[PDB]
Amino acid sequence: VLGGGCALLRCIPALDSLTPANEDQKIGIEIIKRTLKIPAMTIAKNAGVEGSLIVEKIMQSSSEVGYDAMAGDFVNMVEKGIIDPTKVVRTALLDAAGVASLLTTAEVVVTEIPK
Amino acid sequence: VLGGGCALLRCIPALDSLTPANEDQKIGIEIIKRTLKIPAMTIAKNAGVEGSLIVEKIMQSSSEVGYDAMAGDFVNMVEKGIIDPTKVVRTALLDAAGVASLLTTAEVVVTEIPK
Numbered sequence: 001v002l003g004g005g006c007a008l009l010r011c012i013p014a015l016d017s018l019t020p021a022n023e024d025q026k027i028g029i030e031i032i033k034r035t036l037k038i039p040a041m042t043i044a045k046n047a048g049v050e051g052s053l054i055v056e057k058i059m060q061s062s063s064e065v066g067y068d069a070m071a072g073d074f075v076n077m078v079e080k081g082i083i084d085p086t087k088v089v090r091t092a093l094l095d096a097a098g099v100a101s102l103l104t105t106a107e108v109v110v111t112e113i114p115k
Numbered sequence: 116v117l118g119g120g121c122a123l124l125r126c127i128p129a130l131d132s133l134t135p136a137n138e139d140q141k142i143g144i145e146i147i148k149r150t151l152k153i154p155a156m157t158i159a160k161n162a163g164v165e166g167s168l169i170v171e172k173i174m175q176s177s178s179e180v181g182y183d184a185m186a187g188d189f190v191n192m193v194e195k196g197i198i199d200p201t202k203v204v205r206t207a208l209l210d211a212a213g214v215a216s217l218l219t220t221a222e223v224v225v226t227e228i229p230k
């Protein structure tokens with residue numbers, strides 16, 4: 001798939017075409033929708049530019065155009081070689097979600113008293 | 116002038132039309148140029164939205180169009196009543212610049228030892 005976090009960026013209309021069962025389902029869908037811009041923002045923030053403007057300009061662009069953070073330019077990602085494995089992207093998303101969303105169900109935390 | 120920090124936002128091409136004498140003049144001009152977006156970003160950030168995207172969308176819009184943070188929409192600022200006094204804006208800018216730019220010239224700081 002496309003590299004630079006653009007693959008997760010191009011999956012946001014597929015959440016925009018989702019009907020939640022109730023309001024908590026809607027909250028979770030919105031959480032994932034806001035999370036889907038995080039890798040591109042982090043890559044752009046490490047490059048010294050404002051990540052939110054970069055992500056908004058990627059969203060306004062065509063589906064083949066992303067941000068090359070080395071050149072600092074908006075390019076064609078397949079033609080520039082900036083590509084990612086599909087397995088890596090889906091593995092990262094699933095492994096992050098399955099544990100973080102269970103961490104956000106907690107109400108009581110029990111620890112040991114430090115000796 | 117226009118309210119919401121848009122008055123300072125429209126004075127950035129007037130810094131783009133400036134020729135620095137040397138590179139430190141250039142550094143100071145760039146400092147003021149980046150500072151000129153701060154009030155609009157702060158007003159938008161207090162409204163719970165991303166200030167940088169709001170400022171960029173104000174940049175891309177016409178000269179009469181700014182952001183009503185109260186209603187959260189992009190409107191004609193004069194026709195919607197969001198206006199500022201010119202004296203207040205220039206007073207705030209001059210009073211901030213004259214002291215902050217002198218604070219950024221310091222190399223040694225002498226304080227009293229606390230008793």
Ligand SMILES: Nc1ncnc2c1ncn2[C@@H]1O[C@H](COP(=O)(O)OP(=O)(O)OP(=O)(O)O)[C@@H](O)[C@H]1O
Pocket residue numbers: 002003004005039043067068069070071082083084
């Ligand atoms: N020139 C580039 N422009 C834009 N994005 C790029 C560029 N080169 C790599 N990337 C992106 O940066 C990310 C790679 O980051 P990095 O390899 O540091 O971390 P990772 O793959 O998440 O994890 P790990 O630290 O285990 O390697 C990928 O999303 C990749 O598509």
Ligand SMILES: Nc1ncnc2c1ncn2[C@@H]1O[C@H](COP(=O)(O)OP(=O)(O)OP(=O)(O)O)[C@@H](O)[C@H]1O
Pocket residue numbers: 117118119120154158182183184185186197198199
């Ligand atoms: N509805 C609005 N939409 C957008 N900007 C607005 C709106 N109402 C006011 N503003 C802007 O917000 C700013 C007013 O902020 P505020 O009055 O809290 O602080 P101030 O004038 O900088 O200082 P002080 O705290 O001394 O009053 C002005 O720039 C004004 O144009």
